[PDB]
Design an enzyme around this catalytic site. Structure first.
Site, short mmCIF file in Angstrom:
data_model
loop_
_atom_site.label_atom_id
_atom_site.label_comp_id
_atom_site.label_asym_id
_atom_site.label_seq_id
_atom_site.Cartn_x
_atom_site.Cartn_y
_atom_site.Cartn_z
N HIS A 53 -36.09 17.16 -3.33
CA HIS A 53 -36.81 17.03 -2.08
C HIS A 53 -35.95 16.14 -1.19
O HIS A 53 -35.43 15.14 -1.64
CB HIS A 53 -38.17 16.41 -2.34
N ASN A 83 -36.93 15.08 7.01
CA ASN A 83 -37.77 15.16 5.83
C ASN A 83 -38.87 16.14 6.21
O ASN A 83 -39.67 15.82 7.09
CB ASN A 83 -38.41 13.80 5.49
N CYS A 97 -45.25 16.21 -1.07
CA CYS A 97 -43.89 16.74 -1.22
C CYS A 97 -43.69 17.59 -2.45
O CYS A 97 -42.83 18.45 -2.46
CB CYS A 97 -42.88 15.58 -1.25
#
Ligand SMILES: *C(=O)CSCCNC(=O)CCNC(=O)[C@H](O)C(C)(C)COP(=O)(O)OP(=O)(O)OC[C@H]1O[C@@H](n2cnc3c(N)ncnc32)[C@@H](O)[C@@H]1OP(=O)(O)O
Ligand SMILES: *C(=O)CSCCNC(=O)CCNC(=O)[C@H](O)C(C)(C)COP(=O)(O)OP(=O)(O)OC[C@H]1O[C@@H](n2cnc3c(N)ncnc32)[C@@H](O)[C@@H]1OP(=O)(O)O
Lengths: 334, 334
Positions: free
Chosen positions: A256, A287, A120
């Site tokens: 994020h 996500n 990420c």
């Protein structure tokens, strides 16, 4: 023979773009794969819907689409791109680098390219590499693309995190600026996390014992959640100070999209004012891994909810338990 | 963010390597494929290579090469701000190898991310490290190139099984009073994607055996021709943007694709007689991105050349792409 004294300079994000898979998937459809309830997937995560890539939407296709949009916004032709950095963790081709195929497709035959793999945190690492590149005087325009197909590495039939990861890609172009437009990056790790966010197996094992087959994310979401609140919050404030800025200076906070909950906690522990726009694209995006901050950034800038030149705080965090983030001046809306 | 940080200059402070214990002569190679020692040496210059055993995984190799570099630089793991790992033979999507290596190394104060750019990986990583240090945001960066090319070659295929070896090489870069690392040059030739790629992706593996595990497939002649056409001018460009001519060179460290290509590069480039040219392929074979790192470690530790001397490094390959730069060499250890 002390080398040449290169002439630095300043850089900042000139344009952003993105690609969002056409097929949207509501929690209701997700509950048809797993044993869940639309109502659990929302109060816990915060997702009402995510977009899942179809066979034709490979990470290359999505990356080139997201890139074109970034180049259009920046007003920069592919021929002017000196470097293409692609961040991804869902690429099944060992070589050549995705970044080289994207560059070639885009028309950027003057460029080089690596791919980057950092979970990420990938987009914020790529962005700092781009900033350093341009500011060193060695590169003038750099393309950064974060393209992920998390669905390829996660069992949709696994209530663990089958309602968690979405697909998509985000890109940004960085170039010359009269004043510093991207703050120093801040990054760190936990080595004891390796067991909090790993792969069910390695392809090497898949070939030797099929029993533990096709790789796929598995996560101990409690440990990461606590790590996130423990180290990501301080990193976010560091990212702020290192750039010479405070929470009140921000006109946006693009973390994020791991979870709206964690996001609430972050916004909370950080002292984020009610006036600063906060990305929560997770609601309908899900996500998207390293593409998360890129997709959000693109949405933010293209909404009008925030003006150009205003400070924005970005930060990705996750696998390996590592983070990366920096503060940057938002570009003018397209 | 608006805040002009303090720039510095950087250089390579230490280098290290890990060479698998098992040496494999051409004779042993020829018992795996229909070929002869004469043919292999004549076409590649290689007489032997090292093949990694089961216990020598890219992470093991990476750590060991890193500790040699740190030892050489007199730098403590705690002092490392970034760990960049270059590799194309990693069968684990996440978390990043760099983070796993940084943890075992002791550098818990660093972040880092994995880099993937085929044979050009080490040079791209080095330019990232130099830029990070020079930008003021990091003080010491660890770059590691680690590979098991043997994991993505058949070993029975007559076409390339006698070209690769495995191994890792590393370098520590830190502050210098004068520019110690030249600007990076890099480029591509995307029409050359079909001359060097994988037999399949893991995706296609998961769907149908046979298909085999993704294995490397290239067009000798096409790659060789492109390297001679594009890498000779890139090598000259690398010297130029650093303010050097080939004659100020004390060493030339080209990727070890094979000695026949290197021979042409040296000739076409006009490398003067006084410059030491790495010909490690003779006993190392081709180790992809770890090629240059290994050759640099060996060069420096040979005692053939002095610290401070200009050296030209360039990696080239998939697909097609290259990256290279000039740099001032470290004093040999002791
Ligand atoms: C970049 O590198 C990557 S991003 C890594 C992504 N993850 C994050 O970014 C961090 C996310 N943190 C977490 O995901 C949290 O772990 C959760 C909330 C999203 C998942 O739920 P919880 O963590 O609260 O707890 P869990 O014990 O796993 O479940 C608690 C009970 O929930 C019940 N339940 C109800 N319905 C579901 C479905 N449909 N899915 C899974 N099960 C759910 C049962 O699971 C649990 O047990 P109990 O009810 O018997 O006590
Ligand atoms: C980083 O990103 C990647 S680096 C991995 C790819 N890059 C490199 O590998 C370096 C590139 N190296 C090469 O270009 C070499 O220069 C080669 C492979 C081009 C050398 O091969 P040749 O052109 O000389 O051979 P080719 O014309 O294809 O075959 C010629 C004849 O050779 C016979 N032969 C005999 N023994 C062998 C064995 N061991 N292997 C393969 N063939 C062999 C037959 O091959 C051919 O027919 P002929 O001999 O009757 O003319």
């Amino acid at each position: 023979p002390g080398l040449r004294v290169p002439e630095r300079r300043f850089s900042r994000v000139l344009g952003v773009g993105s690609y969002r898979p056409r097929r949207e998937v509501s929690n209701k459809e997700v509950c048809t794969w797993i044993d869940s309830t639309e109502e659990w997937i929302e109060t816990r995560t915060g997702i009402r819907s995510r977009r899942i890539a179809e066979p034709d939407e490979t990470i290359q296709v999505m990356g080139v689409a997201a890139s074109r949009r970034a180049l259009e916004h920046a007003g920069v032709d592919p021929a002017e791109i000196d470097l293409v950095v692609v961040s991804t963790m869902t690429n099944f081709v060992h070589t050549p680098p995705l970044s080289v195929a994207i560059a070639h497709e885009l028309g950027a035959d003057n460029a080089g390219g690596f791919d980057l793999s950092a979970a990420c945190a990938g987009f914020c690492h790529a962005l700092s590499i781009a900033a350093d590149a341009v500011e060193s005087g060695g590169s003038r325009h750099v393309l950064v693309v974060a393209t992920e197909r998390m669905t390829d590495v996660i069992d949709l039939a696994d209530r663990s995190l089958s309602f968690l990861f979405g697909d998509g890609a985000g890109a940004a172009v960085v170039g010359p600026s009269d004043v510093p437009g991207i703050g120093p990056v801040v990054r760190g790790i936990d080595g004891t996390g390796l067991g909090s966010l790993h792969m069910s197996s390695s392809w090497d094992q898949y070939v030797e014992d099929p029993s533990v087959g096709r790789p796929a994310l598995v996560m101990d979401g409690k440990r990461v959640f606590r790590w996130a609140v423990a180290d990501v919050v301080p990193a976010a404030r560091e990212a702020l100070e290192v750039a010479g800025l405070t929470v009140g200076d921000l006109v946006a906070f693009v973390p994020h999209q791991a979870n709206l909950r964690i996001i609430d906690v972050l916004v909370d522990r950080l002292g984020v004012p009610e006036h600063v726009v906060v990305s929560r694209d997770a609601e309908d995006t899900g996500n998207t891994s390293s593409a998360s901050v890129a997709l959000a950034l693109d949405r933010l800038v293209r909404s009008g909810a925030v003006p150009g030149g205003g400070p924005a705080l970005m930060i990705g965090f996750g696998a390996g338990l590592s983070y990366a983030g920096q503060a940057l001046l938002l570009p003018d809306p397209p």
